[PDB]
Amino acid sequence: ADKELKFLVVDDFSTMRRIVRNLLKELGFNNVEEAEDGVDALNKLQAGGYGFVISCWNMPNMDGLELLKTIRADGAMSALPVLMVIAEAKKENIIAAAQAGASGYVVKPFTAATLEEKLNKIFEKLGM
Numbered sequence: 359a360d361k362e363l364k365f366l367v368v369d370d371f372s373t374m375r376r377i378v379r380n381l382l383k384e385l386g387f388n389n390v391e392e393a394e395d396g397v398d399a400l401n402k403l404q405a406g407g408y409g410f411v412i413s414c415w416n417m418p419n420m421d422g423l424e425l426l427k428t429i430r431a432d433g434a435m436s437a438l439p440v441l442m443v444i445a446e447a448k449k450e451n452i453i454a455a456a457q458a459g460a461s462g463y464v465v466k467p468f469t470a471a472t473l474e475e476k477l478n479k480i481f482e483k484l485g486m
Contacts, residue, residue, distance in 0.1 A: 364409050365411070366392070369414035385473060399425055426455065
């Protein structure tokens with residue numbers, strides 16, 4: 359897909375956001391913004407222009423699942439791709455995320471090759 363796509367990386371840990379931003383940079387995606395929680399992310403998404411969201415599951419104020427459910431219920435961004443990042447492979451959370459419309463999930467820490475593969479399969483399914 360277009361490497362110009364604007365990404366939003368959501369996580370309450372700045373170091374984790376830097377890691378994901380670096381992995382996107384390795385893959386050639388330079389247009390990235392950050393958010394510390396689900397509410398902050400929704401506020402940036404309203405600004406428009408985003409094409410992809412990578413979000414942490416566990417965050418204060420509004421967690422990853424609630425952010426995902428809010429994006430999917432929004433008329434202007436209902437199909438916005440959302441990749442969930444989880445700390446452990448808890449089946450209940452993977453299924454909850456899938457049922458809520460996650461585009462995919464990755465267990466951190468993840469490699470650039472894993473990110474690339476997830477991005478490719480996701481854009482592929484969307485015809486982008």
